[model samples]
Target: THPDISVDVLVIGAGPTGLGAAKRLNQIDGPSWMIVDSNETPGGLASTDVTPEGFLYDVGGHVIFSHYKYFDDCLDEALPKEDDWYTHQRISYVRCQGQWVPYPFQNNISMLPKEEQVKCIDGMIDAALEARVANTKPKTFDEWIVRMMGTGIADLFMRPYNFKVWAVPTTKMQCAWLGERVAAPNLKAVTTNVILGKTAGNWGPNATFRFPARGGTGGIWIAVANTLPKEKTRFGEKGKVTKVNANNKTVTLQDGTTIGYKKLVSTMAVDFLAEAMNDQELVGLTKQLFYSSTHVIGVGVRGSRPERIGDKCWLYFPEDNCPFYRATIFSNYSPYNQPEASKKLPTMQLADGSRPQSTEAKEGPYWSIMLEVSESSMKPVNQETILADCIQGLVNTEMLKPTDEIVSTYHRRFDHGYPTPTLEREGALTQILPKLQDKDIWSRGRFGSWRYEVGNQDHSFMLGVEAVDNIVNGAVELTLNYPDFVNGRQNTERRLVDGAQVFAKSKAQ
Candidate 1:
């Protein structure tokens, strides 16, 4: 066996969470450490991809609306220049029945047909009356939706749209994860809007957000990785972990090199980590944590972006008319998302698979849309036909025309795309996480800690930051332990520019 190397802390999987852990560890300058990932590059679920024809697509719709100052600082440090980013106001909509309803669809039933609008207001009134006398908590997500949005809106949008996004039925999920992620409608406001024939304004945290000017979302993380000392990181095959000997506090990589650590911060799926260590009981507990796969499909069409899709950032579809639950106007995010108009490319085929008028290179401004479809055993997706299905879906939903020339298309599937907040998830996590931590292992990040409420880019990053603090100075992990507290308000305490200043300030106060 090769000689075993050692460090104070060993961070596995160089995604946002792993990188976050590494960033904090590096900043503190208190521990001997190394960060590793199986991938050649970082970003994890936050990464972006480029099509052969030069269309850029992120893993899914990833946007940064930071709740923590430290999270913002890391991103700013990576792309320091003001010109490095493009800020945009979120222009989102929901497609239901046959109309484009303003987002937080429950608050804008006025856009729906008059009959449906009346049905919605009646349900809202019923829900409000029920809330007044309700003395118990909602048992499941379905109950929460009905209680908050009423049956009319829940049946129309919340139920179907969420099922498309989560790939699981609402009845199986818990309502605790819906703090800032979902907008709870005001009964009076909704009714007034319906009466006045008006729509609600943007209601969520990401009303305004930024994107990288050059690279897609992945560019931000790549820049962040560059800021760290290179000598401390090991990626690619050399970093591929083969096994974790939790008992011995050593991990064996694919190269047969074993590395010892005082503490381990693993950003991989907690379930997978349990299997890697051969911990049967832990594996059984982790099995209770559920997730869904994501199929990200992209299409690049030749010609200027049509007016029908004007200035929209992303759109959601709940109807069966579309196979995808969401569509992002990727090219609109950045000019670099697609190739310049001057670059000539041949049409793959017409949107309907009709023969091109001529098999020749074409040019001119191009725009693209990226789509996301969730899959699970309960919601099976046909891999072979998904691409075609998405294209047809776009046409059916009126996003594309039958004659639109599809110059490029892309498709990829991520198995552990989303961590489901099932009824048993919290119970399983409460037992599994602390048990691993008792062994000096902090399982964190999206699938890592398995908390979808704090699973966004900002929350995932802080999970790592807090994990480091928890280890170094016995600090509480607000992001991991109290997601609602962190997410409900701006967390300005921890700032990367001034390490530990926030922590010290809080303690003194």
Candidate 2:
């Protein structure tokens, strides 16, 4: 029922990365291209969802931490007004032994009990001694933790907390992904802080981040997609890709229409890409790549923001007191994140599962909490009881009072939630990506490329931008190949203010 069309390039998935590629391809103008996605929306995992009751929740905790000038420029161009965004100093913590310890828990062990402090300090000294004589690189994440943080801190925080986050055992993972992701503790400072009873100051790249003031994080991408020509983009059922015929350079959509392309920029998960190609060898190779599923739970309660939850952006739960590893104060990000006090909704139940005191609709200034729990074959979670378990966990952890009126609850599972940096990850990507490249396909994104080191919103965006530059101009892909490099330094090579006119001007010259 559809006419066959062809382009120089075909971009898949309308997430940040795909949109980034689309933005670049459109800029070049030399390449006839179109962008498509299975979902009608632009953001992939970066998207936001709303409950029927008007509570908004992002996939997890999505905040902007840019490393590229081009990424910043594009976002700025999309949401032009300063009022469109809200910037906040990151107030984060890790709950341990019923106390809120400053985050980078290893560095803040000074707040632990005297007995626990001794254990952490002794381990630090031992780790320092071992580091001086360590000749070999850490072979596993567990080894790296012991080498860097010492056995005591590793035992108390790093190992268990990471296990909850990755949903995989530390011994099975590789440590190369921990560049700016984990802060290396200063031994003397830690020791002195312990003596002086001080907590470490804010640390890491996301010490401060910005969020969309109106829509959850997803608003940014929707705005970005709006800037593009609608005719050039396809989404929803029409955009679903069913098959990829690499030999013929053709892609088949769910509607049985085929389009030809000289180059394919696929932002779908690489494993799914292999299956679509029907490459048995690739499917087998991809089996070696491990990943964890993420379950996001959102609870909207009718009440003023409580003092206990004051100003905290996100909190980490290392202990089993909660099934979720992290919880984001969704409403704290913006007053508009939840419904206004005028919209009335009946309480679903009390947090304790007791019958609601009143079945009548009530109005409120609402607050919301979004929680993320990781699950894998190594760490299985019961799907049937997960929501209930999460609610109980929230009450157990003091995140929610048992009597709080739960107005809205939301839960969704993302199968490819996190790309596990296992020992085999690099080996698989090393071969898998290059082989696809041989066929003029560039796989780049959070799950697309499977590089968690550069997997944030900003990094994923640049992955697509760099891929376009590489395909069009043979520019080096610094974001994909050199994660630490791009992550540690600000990338100002391209600015959105100039747009693609910079490239256009150069081509003319």
Candidate 3:
């Protein structure tokens, strides 16, 4: 770190975005590039946390649903072997009232109690009828929900569950992020299904998803890092970026070394980046951006996979019974996501939040559930008792037995978890990003650009890819600017095998 070091392209925050930039820079081989992250590992939000009991919990629920061929190509390149991944059928559900309603919950009201089904149908029919005569598109997420699912379903699931997920009322959110549209409940199909006593088939992008066979979701990024030159990456304390001196064309690391670059591709949150640069003007604009804090509560129980839980991937909760909006059956992702069947771990508490009677370590099989709770100004979480609260929530939701032994508990709060798609987001982002770009800074990533719709793992990766192209070749950043168009179809321009030269990127001066 002490030696004189400068790169043609300097990548900050080696998450999906940084890795994507480094992967491209390495492939191009023309730009002297280096990637750095504050964390010890490569993956940022996509990383996994391993507990002492050998239980694994991802940042939240991360699934590999790619809309770009290049993202898939990188993943395939990283963990190339056929045995490297586990493809699981995505069986998800929503817990409402007292039953498991197959997800896209609005489409599966047939699973609801008869009275509730009628209530939901009445509103669905009203919403469908209104759609024929409606002229204006929805302005807010609340309007979109009412227009799409109507009041009945909204009151029951959409309104309550969404608030829990975003931790901000739906009315505060804009609808443009949803492509100004959502899958409006199919009136005929829903009604027919209700009459036939049936549920809707799998209806979302992730009907099936792949997870790393070994290192949870984090393993995927680590393997991706291994494909690049070891010297190109800087991780841990010395690697931590402390300041960005845009005026000086340099960034200072925690180790007090100043690294200069011709162009900086920063993947850290724009707000943090602005603070580092000490740009008051940029900071003012970034302040308008709203985001939610995520509380990931993981409970590892000493028991075999419950028959009642089945192979469910993730379950949603919209009721008062739980503080968590969603819970992933993390252990279901891979066998190695948790401890081996015989690994002995003592019970910290019973599922009731009471101290276990015995101090002895016990072993058998274990199953784990990772829950996500969102917090914002609108939704404040009690930091102290949240873990205990979530466990009781599990019991109330019937995901855990009341007397079950809780072996390991993990609770962490991420400050910038979900970049909120508030009405104010576009106004700030539109001005701030270009302002930074004019200063030879490419601020892009999930929180970097702060567009929740395009903030998935795939979109975040391509954000870096396109940033390099924009700098090197004067290419239009489709993923950054045209999220809907890029999200609508698979991107075919770039592949893993084809060199960056195939794209005809101009060499840097």
Off by over 4 Å in 3: 1-3, 182-184, 203-206, 499-509
Q: How far does residue 339 in candidate 2 sit from its true spot (Å)?
A: 1.0
RMSD of 3: 3.1
- Write candidate 1's Cα lDDT for 1-509 as tens digits: 42378899999988889899989888887789999999998888788898889998898466647788888889999999989998887667898877878767877788888889877887888888887787787889999999887898888888998999899999999988886344244787887887788876665445788889988889888999888889999989999998999988999999998999998999999999999999999999998889999999999999888887787477999899888999977888889999999999998888876778887998968999899999998899999999999999998988888899999999999999999999999899999998998999999999999999888888888889899889998889998988778777888877775646556678899
RMSD (Å) per prediction: 3.2, 2.5, 3.1
Clashes of each: 0, 0, 0
Report lDDT (CA) for all predictions. Answer: 0.87, 0.86, 0.87
TM-score of each: 0.95, 0.95, 0.95
Clashes of 1: 0
Q: lDDT by residue for model 2 over 334-429, one digit each (tens)? A: 999899999999999999978897799999989998999999988898988999999999899888899899999999999989999999999999
lDDT of 3 by residue, 1-509 (tens): 33257888999998988898888888777768899998888888988998888889888457547888889989999999989988877677899988888867877888888899888989988998888888888888999999888899999999999999999999999988888445366898888888888776554445777888998878888889889999888888879999999987988998888888999999999999999999999999999999999999999888888887788477889999999999978888888888887888888999987889999988869888899999999899999999889999999999998799999889999999999999898989989998998999999999998988878888888999889878777778999999889978778878765755655644532
Sliding window of 10 residues with minimal summed lDDT for model 1: 179-188
- Which clashing pairs does model 2 show? none
